[PDB]
Amino acid sequence: PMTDQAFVTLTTNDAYAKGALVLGSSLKQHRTTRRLVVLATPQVSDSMRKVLETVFDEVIMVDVLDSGDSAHLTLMKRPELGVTLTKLHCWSLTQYSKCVFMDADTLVLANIDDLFDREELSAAPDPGWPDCFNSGVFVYQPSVETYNQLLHLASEQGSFDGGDQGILNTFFSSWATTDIRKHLPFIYNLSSISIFSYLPAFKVFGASAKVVHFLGRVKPWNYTYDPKTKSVKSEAHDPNMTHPEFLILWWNIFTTNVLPLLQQFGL
Amino acid sequence: FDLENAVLFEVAWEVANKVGGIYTVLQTKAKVTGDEWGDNYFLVGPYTEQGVRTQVELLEAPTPALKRTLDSMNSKGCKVYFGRWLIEGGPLVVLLDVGASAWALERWKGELWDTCNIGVPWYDREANDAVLFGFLTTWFLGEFLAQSEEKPHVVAHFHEWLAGVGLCLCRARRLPVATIFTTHATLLGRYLCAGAVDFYNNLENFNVDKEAGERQIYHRYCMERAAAHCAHVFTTVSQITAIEAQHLLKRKPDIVTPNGLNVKKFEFQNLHAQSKARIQEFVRGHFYGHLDFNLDKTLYFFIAGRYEFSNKGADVFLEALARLNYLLRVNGSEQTVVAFFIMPARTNNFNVETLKGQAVRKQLWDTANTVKEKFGRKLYESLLVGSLPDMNKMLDKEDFTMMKRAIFATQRQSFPPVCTHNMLDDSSDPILTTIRRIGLFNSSADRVKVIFHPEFLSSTSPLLPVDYEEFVRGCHLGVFPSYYEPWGYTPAECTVMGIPSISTNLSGFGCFMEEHIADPSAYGIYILDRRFRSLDDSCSQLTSFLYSFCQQSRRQRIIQRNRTERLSDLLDWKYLGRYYMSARHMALSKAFPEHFTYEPN
Amino acid sequence: FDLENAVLFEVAWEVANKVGGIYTVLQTKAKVTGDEWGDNYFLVGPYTEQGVRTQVELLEAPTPALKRTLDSMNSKGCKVYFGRWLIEGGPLVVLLDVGASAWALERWKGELWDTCNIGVPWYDREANDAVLFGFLTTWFLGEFLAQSEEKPHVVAHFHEWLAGVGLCLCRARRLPVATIFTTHATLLGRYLCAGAVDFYNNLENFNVDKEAGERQIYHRYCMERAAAHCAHVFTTVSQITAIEAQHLLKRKPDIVTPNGLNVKKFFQNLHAQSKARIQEFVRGHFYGHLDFNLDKTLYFFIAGRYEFSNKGADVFLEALARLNYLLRVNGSEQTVVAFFIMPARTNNFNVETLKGQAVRKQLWDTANTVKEKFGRKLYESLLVGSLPDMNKMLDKEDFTMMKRAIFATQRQSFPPVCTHNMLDDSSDPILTTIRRIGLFNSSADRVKVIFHPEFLSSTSPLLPVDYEEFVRGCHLGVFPSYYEPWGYTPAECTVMGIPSISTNLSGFGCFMEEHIADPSAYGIYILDRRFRSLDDSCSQLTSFLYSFCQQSRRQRIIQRNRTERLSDLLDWKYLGRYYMSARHMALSKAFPEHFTYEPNE
Amino acid sequence: GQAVRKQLWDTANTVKEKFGRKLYESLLVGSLPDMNKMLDKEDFTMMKRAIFATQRQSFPPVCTHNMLDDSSDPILTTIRRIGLFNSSADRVKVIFHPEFLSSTSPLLPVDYEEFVRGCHLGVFPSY
Amino acid sequence: GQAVRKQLWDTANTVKEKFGRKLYESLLVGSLPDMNKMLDKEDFTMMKRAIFATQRQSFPPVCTHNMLDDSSDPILTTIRRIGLFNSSADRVKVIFHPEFLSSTSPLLPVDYEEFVRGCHLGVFPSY
């Protein structure tokens, strides 16, 4: 019923569609009252975009190669930032008064509708530079003005990391110092590198994890799951697999509530 | 015809939340139903935080019996609220939360399977939400009846498919409350139209089960059909919807209850003129440099609503406009037609050309006013002295330059744009593609100019900051050649305003008008017979209608407008209140007739 | 400052009944005195049926002490009413009725003779009624003190000779009351100024007892002198009034308490709008003799009651003739328009004045219609892209309307000096002087006099302008009064931005001289009639008027703005201090021991 | 009567502006207006004077301009005879305006054209 | 922020005008306004929406303009270090306007001289 508010997420391919399918499912499992609107680039296949059409309410399409797209001019200035400019379209969703953006490599462990309590660019302190906001999970408020300002910054100064985190951190520098309510508890955007890098804190504050963020090169969908053993392909130490539950809970959710939807639509 | 103890409970998903047109119906039905059922009028609807604060003032129970019910509901892990909706008639509203889904998975859903052999997929939000809503409504009314002294007459009016889970359960739990189920649209109908080649004629032929399954909408269909079968009295919004219901739901509507609107919309002939002026200003701006068209002779035609190319039959309108263009060209007419397609799409901000054109109009107006003011002063001063104005010298060198800049700014350049906002996908836009193909490109030679505004007209917008109602009032004619419209909310609004409106046999409003008016044309509401004609022949029929309107005398058009203002009463709730009252009385009669029996009207 | 158990009783004849200017003072004093004395502020005043009906709310006594007091008096054959005056600050008013106690007038008069040896003649109403009021006020105070067991200390500020009986009696009864008397204007002064050739210089020479007896106003005099002698603190409105008081009432004012005005009269935009309206009146009145430049034109005005001697309008009129000569002989573009807005026996608007305003209307209407038509044609021409053909823009239809307009303007007779046809023209001092002075509004004359015999009002057909709005337009206000105790009119002008010439004989003028070392800079010019002869004063005014005329636009703007800053000096906030001192001095003079009753100065 | 209408309108404007300020201040704080606190004590005295102004015991006049000869006027004589004194009970109130309507006049500022346009019906029975 | 101020002012005007009419109508009958009845259900919704717009938990920004180069800005860096973040608790609120004040600009559409005249004090610790 909360038609005014949404969780948003970005799928740039079929690979990150499986991520989004799991994220979306996890939000449903923890009984969000809020609409889950994905954003899909043209690159997502028609067959996959029907599965994303079942689970997620509105697969709003953002393409930065089309000359009608608002970001197209910017892309011609910054051709390396296609993904970033696509993500920034989250601010164009003016049908919603407030949204939570979540990268497709996140997984929800408990109801986080309380994220909607927080105001514009409330994001977890990023692991590593703890003065930058992990743009994996950020409450945010759609606006054409904000969006245009972000594109301007993208063209004019670009991004330090050549990514969403950089372009957002430069524009919302106030987060680091202005208000503590804008800081989200790390448990709302728990990067696994934190469980690996600083295991002791996780042992103590890990139980309370609300969102896990799968960082590093090898994303959750990439792993191999033997349902018979319920055990993921175990590499040498991988940050995700420091906790054999966070990824297991990804794979289970996939198998239980997606492979059914995927098979039906021909994947 | 006396409801001694009857309690009316209109259950709908849009009771406090504006998701769709149903919400307008309830908000408007509430006043009239208010009078008939007094304080026994209770609205059961989903809780929305934003909705509740803006629209609802929280209240305490009027009835000690109700207080018990509210308390019991609050106790067992549910967060029901009670309040007075601030809409006309001040109805008491029980807004239950669908966020209290404590045991919904595998307990409420589990129960539903045992009761109705129906299941809801995990992925669907709307169906999942409806099971929560339905179960809660069934519980509420059942608990109310049990905790209160037994009222043999309580009437629960379910107003949509997703409220229908409640009706299924209520009848199944053998609760004595009378149940009315109303389908404002057929779920399968929407998908089958457009989705299939020929939905309307093959109605009987279609195996509903197969089609529903194919679209992964089967659960929703089953719920809608179950609710229809379950209800003692089944109602449909329009006669066309009834035909759909007969074949798709496999149940004839017991009664057909048309939707209605308020009469509060409005010499009062200022508005057609004031609004036309505002519209005329936009046209001047948009078409700057190609203003050879007589701007008093120009007629404005518009199609509005949501964006559906097939459903709202924008294609039929566009094809018909091309034929009208040909007719106007071949037979020379001072009159020019400007067609406004005010259908919302995803687009960028106002196109450079459009914005510049409006700016140039502003500049020209500003220059004219400043020079006019200076002429005013110099004329007044000259007259005061007692001398002739001397028009040649009245305008100073300074104004001559300002005007020279103005005339330069209004350079003809390229042909004016067809779309006010640049579309995200201009290439593939169903409208724009057709406009290009049909040949309407706003060329100087063309007598028909198409202006597509892809944003709902609003006061906030810089260009044409006109509220939809005001824009509608300004236009000469409204063309809504709808294919699937179950009820035409858009055409209805237009007619209540007094704008003559094309409707179709396939639109519910069209069918309603045919049934209620012996000649559609005379009263200004044209009917296109799209049900019994082929697509091309229908287009030709529209062209004939459009052309007839164009060739109407100025005086004749005025008469036509005044005639439409009489047709508002047909759509007023006063008159349309009869049909639903009939449905409610029929409900009481159908089951447990002994207490109250009423013979048919 | 220990006023906790002090009660302020501002006895006055104008507490509810608007007899005079004193009424404005009280109505304006009430707010500030309200703060100082809290709810102990009582405005004992005469009872008028009209007064209680429109301006006085009826309420019950706030403190029980008075309930007994009002009750005792009400039961003893007298009528007293308590209520809140509905003016700003809501001052509680005890209205004694001077008709209801008529029965005891003969008793009261008897007592007065024994007590104060001041008989009041049978014929005089104003005093017979004042004796009733005075005796009743003394009674109220006595009863208050008696019925209030914890005895407060009361300060009764009588505000005129009409309330003067009370002070005389109160002092003699030896009631524990601190009594202040105030002479807002010396009684003898008004009669002497008109009556005698040289009132001001012979003030020492005049024997008050002799003079008053001759004018058969002796009793009224005796009461005012008696009150002044009796009053613990005697105050006067202005320093000029103080000079009169020393030599006429024979008791020097202890404090000078100026009658300030609440600044709710309150800018450049308003000034401009008002000047435009005034300019339009002038355009109309001159009816084709508009050979002068209106931008350069200056407006001077004199307002108040129609007193030729008192408002010294003769000085202004003579000085305007001298200004005319100076302006004409020297090079002058600037033209002075002098508006004498003084009430007279007007019959109706003079033919020419009414007709003149109608031709302004016609020319404005004709110009507006042609202006509008040109504007539309220009806008249409600019939209096409063609630069307007100036010759073509005005149609033959326009050249007829404008030709009629020009034909109306033509006049031979010079515009009238007075806007209203007078019932009696020959007697009118203003008109006789205008004729003598030679200001007939001839084309050659640089000074044009427009005498408006009716107080400017919104109701008036020619000019629906309130005095305030007209004042805000005029450039300067000239008030060369001879006997103004406190020019209310000049004070109003100064509170408004308007620079105002005032006399050393006016209260406002003397007050400004005392309070500002260099008067001229701030826009208040002080014409010195006190030590100068009449002709030399006129010459001095001519010099002032000429100086104002020979002032560049920017310099004049400065003058007016400096005037606005002088508003604070007049406002009751600041000016309340002088009366507060008077009360504190009265409290100090009587019952010195009690509380903190000692004077700082 | 026209003056009291002016007074009531002026009182309305003064109170309305004061309400405007207080409402704007209250809305800025984020609280809905506290009814019964919006109006200051001064505002009550202003309005109490106004309510005192809008009190009459005499039935409202039937002729806007005073007649040179009231007895002579055929219209006025009939207005009396027929029994139209514009009493509270009467549903038909007759207002005879003797002056040709003009824009300049304080009462009914409309020109004849505009007054004609305002009226619902024009009854012109003519022998 | 400026837009919300505009909305609240506009709303207060709309409610004010409606109060104006209702007060004027109430006064015309001779009764002091019944305060509770003055405000209609239609306005209660408009005002409720207005007070909903006001609601914020985030401190107002320290600059008025989005800075093309933010992190470098000496003023902003110092404001952050100093701890003046316009917090509710803070008695000192810093508003940095990096553009010459202009009539064209939407916010504070006053030229330098007028703005200077409005401020209570000017601090120029020039080195």
PDB file of C-alpha atoms in Angstrom, chain D residues 18-114:
ATOM      1  CA  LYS D  18      -3.533  39.008  11.783  1.00  0.00           C
ATOM      2  CA  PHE D  19      -4.833  35.430  11.410  1.00  0.00           C
ATOM      3  CA  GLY D  20      -2.712  35.196   8.247  1.00  0.00           C
ATOM      4  CA  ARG D  21       0.462  36.101  10.132  1.00  0.00           C
ATOM      5  CA  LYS D  22      -0.330  33.848  13.101  1.00  0.00           C
ATOM      6  CA  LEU D  23      -1.287  30.933  10.841  1.00  0.00           C
ATOM      7  CA  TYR D  24       1.870  31.391   8.742  1.00  0.00           C
ATOM      8  CA  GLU D  25       3.976  31.453  11.919  1.00  0.00           C
ATOM      9  CA  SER D  26       2.156  28.397  13.304  1.00  0.00           C
ATOM     10  CA  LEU D  27       2.431  26.452  10.036  1.00  0.00           C
ATOM     11  CA  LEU D  28       6.167  27.254   9.883  1.00  0.00           C
ATOM     12  CA  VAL D  29       6.668  25.756  13.366  1.00  0.00           C
ATOM     13  CA  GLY D  30       4.879  22.639  12.058  1.00  0.00           C
ATOM     14  CA  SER D  31       1.745  22.797  14.242  1.00  0.00           C
ATOM     15  CA  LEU D  32      -1.871  23.051  12.987  1.00  0.00           C
ATOM     16  CA  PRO D  33      -3.465  26.408  14.050  1.00  0.00           C
ATOM     17  CA  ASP D  34      -4.756  26.471  17.612  1.00  0.00           C
ATOM     18  CA  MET D  35      -8.342  27.682  17.185  1.00  0.00           C
ATOM     19  CA  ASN D  36      -9.389  30.049  19.983  1.00  0.00           C
ATOM     20  CA  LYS D  37      -5.750  31.243  20.322  1.00  0.00           C
ATOM     21  CA  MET D  38      -5.511  32.816  16.830  1.00  0.00           C
ATOM     22  CA  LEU D  39      -7.620  35.839  17.784  1.00  0.00           C
ATOM     23  CA  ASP D  40      -5.959  38.401  20.091  1.00  0.00           C
ATOM     24  CA  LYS D  41      -7.824  40.505  22.695  1.00  0.00           C
ATOM     25  CA  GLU D  42      -7.545  43.570  20.432  1.00  0.00           C
ATOM     26  CA  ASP D  43      -9.158  41.594  17.594  1.00  0.00           C
ATOM     27  CA  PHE D  44     -12.129  40.848  19.853  1.00  0.00           C
ATOM     28  CA  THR D  45     -12.548  44.562  20.611  1.00  0.00           C
ATOM     29  CA  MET D  46     -12.337  45.322  16.874  1.00  0.00           C
ATOM     30  CA  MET D  47     -14.945  42.668  16.072  1.00  0.00           C
ATOM     31  CA  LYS D  48     -17.160  43.555  19.065  1.00  0.00           C
ATOM     32  CA  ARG D  49     -17.344  47.155  17.772  1.00  0.00           C
ATOM     33  CA  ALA D  50     -18.174  45.776  14.314  1.00  0.00           C
ATOM     34  CA  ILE D  51     -20.984  43.538  15.662  1.00  0.00           C
ATOM     35  CA  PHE D  52     -22.260  46.596  17.565  1.00  0.00           C
ATOM     36  CA  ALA D  53     -22.217  48.537  14.276  1.00  0.00           C
ATOM     37  CA  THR D  54     -24.269  45.852  12.466  1.00  0.00           C
ATOM     38  CA  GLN D  55     -27.338  46.305  14.710  1.00  0.00           C
ATOM     39  CA  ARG D  56     -30.584  47.976  13.598  1.00  0.00           C
ATOM     40  CA  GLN D  57     -34.141  47.920  14.932  1.00  0.00           C
ATOM     41  CA  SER D  58     -35.707  49.909  12.059  1.00  0.00           C
ATOM     42  CA  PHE D  59     -36.613  47.913   8.926  1.00  0.00           C
ATOM     43  CA  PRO D  60     -34.098  48.513   6.063  1.00  0.00           C
ATOM     44  CA  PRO D  61     -34.950  51.500   3.766  1.00  0.00           C
ATOM     45  CA  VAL D  62     -36.995  51.075   0.591  1.00  0.00           C
ATOM     46  CA  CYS D  63     -35.434  54.073  -1.184  1.00  0.00           C
ATOM     47  CA  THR D  64     -31.683  54.605  -1.500  1.00  0.00           C
ATOM     48  CA  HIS D  65     -31.806  58.343  -2.259  1.00  0.00           C
ATOM     49  CA  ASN D  66     -33.968  60.604  -0.067  1.00  0.00           C
ATOM     50  CA  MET D  67     -36.958  61.857  -2.076  1.00  0.00           C
ATOM     51  CA  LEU D  68     -37.714  65.570  -2.498  1.00  0.00           C
ATOM     52  CA  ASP D  69     -41.363  64.597  -2.042  1.00  0.00           C
ATOM     53  CA  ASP D  70     -41.832  61.074  -0.609  1.00  0.00           C
ATOM     54  CA  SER D  71     -45.634  61.310  -0.526  1.00  0.00           C
ATOM     55  CA  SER D  72     -45.757  62.302  -4.201  1.00  0.00           C
ATOM     56  CA  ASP D  73     -43.614  59.431  -5.540  1.00  0.00           C
ATOM     57  CA  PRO D  74     -46.038  56.897  -7.134  1.00  0.00           C
ATOM     58  CA  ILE D  75     -43.522  54.039  -6.701  1.00  0.00           C
ATOM     59  CA  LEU D  76     -42.992  54.770  -2.991  1.00  0.00           C
ATOM     60  CA  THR D  77     -46.720  55.270  -2.296  1.00  0.00           C
ATOM     61  CA  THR D  78     -47.421  51.816  -3.757  1.00  0.00           C
ATOM     62  CA  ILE D  79     -44.478  50.168  -1.883  1.00  0.00           C
ATOM     63  CA  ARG D  80     -46.255  51.265   1.327  1.00  0.00           C
ATOM     64  CA  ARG D  81     -49.819  50.392   0.213  1.00  0.00           C
ATOM     65  CA  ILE D  82     -48.950  46.928  -1.146  1.00  0.00           C
ATOM     66  CA  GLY D  83     -47.288  46.083   2.203  1.00  0.00           C
ATOM     67  CA  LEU D  84     -43.631  45.985   1.252  1.00  0.00           C
ATOM     68  CA  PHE D  85     -41.711  47.714   4.040  1.00  0.00           C
ATOM     69  CA  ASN D  86     -38.814  45.199   3.699  1.00  0.00           C
ATOM     70  CA  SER D  87     -39.600  43.599   7.086  1.00  0.00           C
ATOM     71  CA  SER D  88     -37.577  40.524   8.151  1.00  0.00           C
ATOM     72  CA  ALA D  89     -40.681  38.424   7.361  1.00  0.00           C
ATOM     73  CA  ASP D  90     -41.042  39.769   3.788  1.00  0.00           C
ATOM     74  CA  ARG D  91     -39.524  37.626   1.033  1.00  0.00           C
ATOM     75  CA  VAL D  92     -39.723  40.517  -1.451  1.00  0.00           C
ATOM     76  CA  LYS D  93     -37.649  43.635  -0.702  1.00  0.00           C
ATOM     77  CA  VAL D  94     -37.944  46.644  -2.977  1.00  0.00           C
ATOM     78  CA  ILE D  95     -35.018  49.056  -3.396  1.00  0.00           C
ATOM     79  CA  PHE D  96     -36.032  52.164  -5.368  1.00  0.00           C
ATOM     80  CA  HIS D  97     -32.856  53.926  -6.586  1.00  0.00           C
ATOM     81  CA  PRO D  98     -34.032  57.357  -7.895  1.00  0.00           C
ATOM     82  CA  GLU D  99     -30.733  58.461  -9.386  1.00  0.00           C
ATOM     83  CA  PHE D 100     -29.721  57.153 -12.822  1.00  0.00           C
ATOM     84  CA  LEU D 101     -27.134  54.543 -11.838  1.00  0.00           C
ATOM     85  CA  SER D 102     -23.567  55.804 -12.326  1.00  0.00           C
ATOM     86  CA  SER D 103     -20.019  54.548 -11.696  1.00  0.00           C
ATOM     87  CA  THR D 104     -19.219  57.579  -9.508  1.00  0.00           C
ATOM     88  CA  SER D 105     -21.892  56.874  -6.862  1.00  0.00           C
ATOM     89  CA  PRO D 106     -20.676  55.282  -3.554  1.00  0.00           C
ATOM     90  CA  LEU D 107     -23.706  52.961  -3.314  1.00  0.00           C
ATOM     91  CA  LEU D 108     -23.871  50.366  -6.119  1.00  0.00           C
ATOM     92  CA  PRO D 109     -20.707  51.577  -7.973  1.00  0.00           C
ATOM     93  CA  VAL D 110     -21.746  49.654 -11.135  1.00  0.00           C
ATOM     94  CA  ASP D 111     -22.684  51.598 -14.301  1.00  0.00           C
ATOM     95  CA  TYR D 112     -26.189  50.915 -15.676  1.00  0.00           C
ATOM     96  CA  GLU D 113     -24.692  48.369 -18.096  1.00  0.00           C
ATOM     97  CA  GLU D 114     -23.002  46.411 -15.303  1.00  0.00           C
TER      98      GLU D 114
END
